[PDB]
């Protein structure tokens, strides 16, 4: 259920503005000639992660992809090979609670072309198992 | 410069994905049927934050209006009366260099046609 104080709560546990997903992002796409080490790099550090932080490299390459495209099609391009992978180790590794977060931000996915509705489709089959 | 051990530092420091932007996003968007009342905790919390965590208030809401689009009016709708405040708020009183970001964040909305060139410009004009 909603409550004001819940929502107290949850915007009080929000990151400083200089850790933020969104800021990291943009350091990446000003990056993005670097796009393939940044993706190599992610998904390493994605692996030994801890369980409750899995899930935020998902939101982080969300972000990444999704604003990147305005800039150029480098992280689209780079990060398609390590997706399956990576959305298959967050559902089975990740802390509790991944699943809607993750089938939405697909859903989202599809309906904005960020990749193909085939390869949309591996990445739900990947967290079905 | 870009180096892999920077970024080794920097995704380090993400947040708990139970407390990140996405996540709280998800659960307004769930609870849309009550976005008067989200908006105004949301800014009067705004008002409250420390000037190193305002701009993460900005990202929310970015988050949530854009994707609330599929869902509903609601967000777009509570939002507007908010949302010149709160950029004036927080280019005025959030650590330097938000300018930058917000600048991007409202070319963004003006691109996805999050809202109107009008009010787009109303909320650019905020700032300075």
Not at 31 to 55: C, D, F, M, Q, T
Not at 86 to 114: M, T, Y
Request: with cysteine.
């Amino acid at each position: 259920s909603f409550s004001e104080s819940a929502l107290e709560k949850k915007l009080s546990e929000l990151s400083n503005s200089q850790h933020s997903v969104q800021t990291l992002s943009l350091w990446l796409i000003h990056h993005r000639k670097h796009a393939g080490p940044i993706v190599s790099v992610w998904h390493r550090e994605l692996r030994k992660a801890k369980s409750n932080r899995k899930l935020t490299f998902l939101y982080l390459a969300n972000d990444v992809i999704q604003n990147s495209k305005r800039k150029g099609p480098e992280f689209t391009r780079e990060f398609e090979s390590v997706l399956v992978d990576a959305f298959s180790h967050v559902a089975r590794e990740a802390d509790e609670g991944c699943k809607k977060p993750l089938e939405r931000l697909l859903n989202i996915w599809q309906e904005r072309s960020v990749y193909g509705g085939e390869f949309i489709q591996q990445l739900k089959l990947s967290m079905e198992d």
